[PDB]
DNA sequence: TAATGCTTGTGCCTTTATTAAAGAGGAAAGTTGCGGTGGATTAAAGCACCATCGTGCGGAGAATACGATAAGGCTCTTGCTTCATTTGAAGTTATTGACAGTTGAATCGAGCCGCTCAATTGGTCAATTATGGAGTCAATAAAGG
DNA sequence: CCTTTATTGACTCCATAATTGACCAATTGAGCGGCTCGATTCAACTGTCAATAACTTCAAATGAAGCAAGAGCCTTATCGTATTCTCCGCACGATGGTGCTTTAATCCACCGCAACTTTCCTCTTTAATAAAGGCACAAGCATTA
């Protein structure tokens, strides 16, 4: 699993940039988005497998993202 | 042939998807980087279905937000192009 | 035999809800009257966001709730926006608003 | 094992306000999981609250006043009419 | 005589005030003002001195915040002056 | 006690402002931020009030203001 | 009669820490070690910030520490400035910080 | 009303870290806050850990997950260290 | 304005799957008795908030000249959109294996409750020294030449 | 680069109040023992996550125009700024009243414990109907003339 962050293509920016109301796009938006991606997946994903890891086990389950979730002011309804 | 002026197929793509709901990530990628992104912390992990789901609806959400901001901080400069300065402009006021 | 949901006019479970703050250990003890006011503020807000996301539902001719219309009615009102800043609903999709400047 | 939940009491509400309106079972998680957190908030800001003043007791008092440091404004009044009105028909009876 | 400059003035005004803690709005002022405010609340209600300066510290912090993100948004838009547009942006990408 | 938003005069705003590190200011930055402040002020005031009337007091402490601000994520220290 | 601070080789009120757990009703029971390492993390953390302070005040040619130069150590570090994000300090000031356009 | 701080401990502590620097009330104030503050978050953490898990006991490993959860990165780290090391040398004795 | 491509919303047939409906029991809600622990009441006193009053200045308010920055407009070129072609990887189906999460019991380890006692810590008082303020010097920095 | 003038750190001397130390109360931490329960380990079982493979095929990649938006430069004006004069209400020191905060004792009332009964909700199973998909059609929007 190496250099997977260029699986999120030009498209799905794009589309994700159109659902938010963006008319037009620069050429560096792609890469400044991936990083930021990336930040907000690192930061949730080691908050979710620190609370997977407290329960001694070794899958992570939706309660524990969503846990994860909340502990950032970002509460999400529709997985509990 | 018949070609659209640039900015009118924009904007048909901003009505349309607007009013759907579905995911705009492919899902099997997005596996992928989260299950490498994991990899770093712990390894042997696995992940349940719906908590990659929650992940990606959560990142999707997130991502469409900090556009809305990023578009807002454009137009503030009399333009209509999002620029990286425009993102981190957005993300530094948002305290990140 | 009567229900305490009953007894106070209310459709909420008042005896699940005592039973609820006494598992959670949010006190030592808990008054008689404690659980009626929780059950009715909760009953008042659910009946006030299915009135909302109802509503949306009739304005787009469909006779059923669903998460985008909860989405709409939460976005819509002021007061439950302020509730809810931060809520992400699941399949609810954005509210449609497109700049002004953007438009030809 | 039984998961308990708010369907019911929330079909039953639904159908109070809406007579001809039905509900998707995504709606009802939704809506489940938006009052589970209501409670949640509440219950904390009352014993924080109880805690506070050194009262061991939690009593309608407490919840009124959560509900008005939790709920905004018009909903707060609103909401806090509609304790009030159950309380006292409680108490009457 | 002798006059400065505009700016030089200003920018000796944001180096001197930077280095020093104390408060800034006269507390007559402000104190007059806060209960004005809880008056709307509750009649014949008594503010207890340090309560004051609390909600002081708190405006004066709030303020010089905001201010720092209105700056922020002013040279992103290639100016020098500080405008009410400025403010509305910052605080609707906060969140207010 | 009528008009006392007034009582927030130009210096004081000139003052905050290059606390900030603003170096000019337009016209019409001083009735934003006395709108502003007084929207900050209504909510702070207003929770501290609620925090008073629970203890079934009359005079607002430091405490009731501390528990305020800190119900917004502005949390003080030094009036402990 | 050897207190538990000096078993565990602290300074921190191990006892005081205890029974701040047990008034506070955390939970219906408190293991024995969790006083010994909360009391821990907070005297590291109290020992942190407070070398930073002094080192502040010391840059500063002053023999005390005031709340000017705790302001200063927080906000001139990563991730004390990540704690301590929302977080007001009481006569504390703001790190001097000119833009770079504003500059002739 | 005898009130109780940690003024005395962040005092030795300071004299262990900076033996001729002095502190000033405010000083104290400020950092007896901060500590208290840490402290509640800490608490409520494990507390919220203990509710999760249906464990009625706060044991060493509820306050080292609340410490990962809550504290940043290195700091975290590095308060995890040094109350495993206070722990151990508690069991030792 | 106008014909035309053309993408979207309208309307009907199907179908499936997602919601509507019924029973066992089992898990939990309502009853009753008890009693002691917490809450409401009462009485007092003391301390902190309020309000008056003098004052005498430093900071606020207004005018004035002005010069520097915001804004509008022209140019141009390059970056970003749109459309045709091709393919490469995602979504789905069906199968399988084995690890990991749950549930149930024994039990041995462990934290709570109760009382004792002793000792660390906290409010009060006495003190001195770094820090605050005043006044002056030298270094620093800006503006017209 | 230079001179002149305004601004501020540095330096010292004096007042001061603010931090340091001692005492003695007084509140609470360490000790010891019994006891009930909980969390630890063991064990089977079962749920599902990961892995393989093939098939389709549509969305992503690439390229060729197409063109219009961002940016640089010039010009104008008007508006925030620095400076001088005037006045005004704010911060400070003193004093007096009082109400409202806090503490102590009492009485009563009300909620947790516990066993019981009964009752209402929740998996498992059966059914059915409304929204998604598909196919055909209208219809307003954009585009170059």
Redesign the interface.
């Known amino acids: 699993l190496r250099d997977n962050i260029q699986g999120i293509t030009k498209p799905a920016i794009r589309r994700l940039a159109r659902?938010?109301?963006v008319?037009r796009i620069s050429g560096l938006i792609y890469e400044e988005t991936r990083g930021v991606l990336k930040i907000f997946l690192e930061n949730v994903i080691r908050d979710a497998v620190t609370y997977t890891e407290h329960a001694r086990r070794k899958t992570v389950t939706a309660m524990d993202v969503v846990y994860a979730?909340k502990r950032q002011?970002?509460?999400?309804?529709?997985?509990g | 042939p018949h070609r659209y002026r640039p900015?009118?197929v924009a904007?048909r793509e901003?009505?349309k998807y607007?009013?759907?709901?579905?995911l705009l990530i492919r899902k099997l990628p997005f596996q992928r980087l989260v299950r490498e992104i994991a990899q770093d912390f712990k390894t042997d992990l696995r992940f349940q279905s719906h908590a990659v789901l929650a992940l990606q609806?959560?990142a999707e959400?997130y991502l469409?937000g900090l556009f809305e901001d990023t578009?807002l901080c454009a137009?503030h400069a009399k333009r209509?192009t999002i620029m990286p300065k425009d993102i981190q402009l957005a993300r530094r006021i948002r305290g990140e | 035999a009567t229900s305490?949901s009953s007894?106070?006019?209310?459709?909420?479970?008042v005896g699940?809800?005592a039973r609820?703050?006494k598992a959670?250990?949010?006190?030592?003890?808990?008054?008689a009257?404690?659980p009626?006011?929780?059950?009715?503020?909760?009953?008042?807000?659910?009946?006030?966001?299915?009135?909302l996301?109802?509503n949306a539902?009739?304005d787009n001719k469909k006779?059923?709730?669903?998460?985008?219309?909860?989405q709409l009615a939460v976005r819509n009102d002021e007061?439950?926006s302020?509730?809810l800043?931060?809520?992400?609903?699941?399949?609810?999709?954005?509210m449609?608003?497109?700049?002004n400047?953007?438009?030809? | 094992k039984n998961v308990?939940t708010?369907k019911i009491?929330?079909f039953?509400?639904?159908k109070?306000?809406?007579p001809?309106?039905?509900?998707?079972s995504?709606?009802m998680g939704?809506?489940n999981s938006?009052?589970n957190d209501?409670?949640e908030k509440?219950?904390?800001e009352?014993?924080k609250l109880?805690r506070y003043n050194k009262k061991?007791?939690?009593?309608?008092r407490?919840?009124?006043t959560a509900?008005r440091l939790?709920?905004?404004?018009?909903?707060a009044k609103?909401?806090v009419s509609?304790?009030?009105?159950?309380?006292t028909?409680?108490?009457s009876?």
Do not use: C, W
């Open positions: 659902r938010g109301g008319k979730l002011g970002r509460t999400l309804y529709g997985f | 900015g009118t904007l901003i009505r607007q009013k759907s709901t579905e609806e959560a959400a469409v578009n137009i209509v | 305490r007894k106070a006019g209310l459709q909420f479970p699940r809800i609820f703050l959670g250990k949010y006190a030592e003890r808990v008054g009257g404690a009626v006011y929780l059950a009715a503020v909760l009953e008042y807000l659910a009946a006030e966001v299915l009135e996301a109802g539902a009739r006779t059923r709730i669903v998460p985008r219309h909860i007061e439950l302020k509730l800043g931060d809520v992400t609903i699941a399949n609810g999709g954005v449609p608003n497109i700049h400047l953007l438009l030809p | 308990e708010y009491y929330i039953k509400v639904l109070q306000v809406h001809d309106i039905g509900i998707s995504k709606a939704i809506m938006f009052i209501i409670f509440l219950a904390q009352s014993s109880a061991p007791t939690i009593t309608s407490e919840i009124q509900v939790v709920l905004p404004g018009e909903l609103h909401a509609e304790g009030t009105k159950a309380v028909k409680f108490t009876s």
